[PDB]
């Protein structure tokens, strides 16, 4: 049982090319990459 | 059982070519990458 | 159990070309790299 | 059980060509590459 | 249990060509490497 | 049970190429390197 | 003659009681303040 | 002539009681303070 | 003439109480405090 | 003429009871203080 | 004619009570102190 | 003509009761204290 609060995220992102995965700000769970 | 809070996370990131792994700013759980 | 709060995290990349793994900030779980 | 608080974390990275392990600012828990 | 509280953590990084490791600013676990 | 705290930790890096180990600022924990 | 361009800047503020001056993100101009 | 660009600015603030002065993150030009 | 750029400024301030002055992260300029 | 660039500044500060004079993390200029 | 460039300044500051100068990180130019 | 290029600059400080002076980390031109 995950209990996540009282977050204040930024995120600055620049030239994303051909992205292919994953590219997440704030993530609660699981990441199964193949 | 996790309990995350109050977290003030700045993500800067700049020339992201062909990602295919995970780029995450705040994770709370597992990762599996192959 | 985890507990972890009051984090303020300040996070700069430059230059990420062909990622294939994890490019995190801030974690908290396990993590597995094949 | 883990407690971590109170985290004033400042990651600064530059060239991260190909990476294929862990980049983590700041991580509770395990790690396990293969 | 592990109690881990006020760091003011600064990482400075530069040329990470074809990292497979783990790079961490603050860690709090454990870790296992292949 | 380990107690951890006010620790002003600055890491320098430069030029990690082909890092296949834990490079890590601080660290409370075990590591297991094979 | 004045030229700016091209910042990323964040701001955080927590706890501003009883303010009677500037609190100004970012400011290209004359301060007087008396 | 100023000329200011390219500026990645993170300004953390805490605790800001009966403030009579100027808190700036990024200034351009000038302050005078009587 | 000023020529000012490529900064990456990051700034923690903590218990800033009846603050009379300037309290900046970058300035590019002139400051007269009386 | 000032030429200024390529500057990575972390500026940590703590109880700053009342400061009448400048904080500054970068400064590009002329400071005069009565 | 100044040329500053490529710094990587660390900057931490504990308990400044009263301060009536100047706590300055980098600065480029001239100081001035009645 | 100055030129100041490639420092990796780390200060502490600790207890700076009624600072009247400079307190600098880097600096680049004059000083002038009455």
């Known amino acids: 049982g995950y209990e996540v609060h009282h977050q204040k995220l930024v995120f600055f992102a620049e030239x994303v ?18």
């Open 17 to 34: 090319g051909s992205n292919k995965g994953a590219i997440i700000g704030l993530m609660v769970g699981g990441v199964v990459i193949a």
